[PDB]
């Protein structure tokens, strides 16, 4: 990769933010400390612990 070009599409940006940052299929470790609950990603938080 050498150059990044802006296509300007919000719906495609939403789907990518969803597949990469918000709800990734293969998420990062997200360890369970004394302060953290234990959830790996955002999608699992509102799925089992919604308030």
């Amino acid at each position: 990769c050498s150059i990044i070009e802006g296509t300007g599409n919000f719906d495609k940006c939403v789907s990518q933010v969803e597949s990469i940052l918000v709800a990734p299929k293969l998420p990062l470790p997200a360890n369970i400390e004394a302060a953290s609950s234990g959830f790996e990603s955002v999608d699992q938080v509102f799925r089992f612990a919604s308030s």
């Binding site: 299929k25 293969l26 998420p27 790996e40 699992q44 089992f48």
Partner: protein, 51 residues
């Protein structure tokens, strides 16, 4: 040859689509399949060692 008397039973029952213990973490779904216990395949095929 009985299903209940089988030694693989505590692990095979733990790894299934019916079982909600795995559904909490998406990384856990791949962890059991890699150890030859596939939750996708039915109990009769899951317990049986091919060839």
């Amino acid at each position: 040859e009985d299903v209940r008397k089988n030694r693989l039973k505590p692990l095979a029952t733990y790894c299934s689509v019916h079982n909600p213990e795995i559904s909490f973490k998406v990384t856990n779904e791949m962890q059991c399949r890699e150890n030859s216990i596939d939750p996708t395949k039915p109990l009769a095929e899951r317990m049986k060692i091919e060839n």
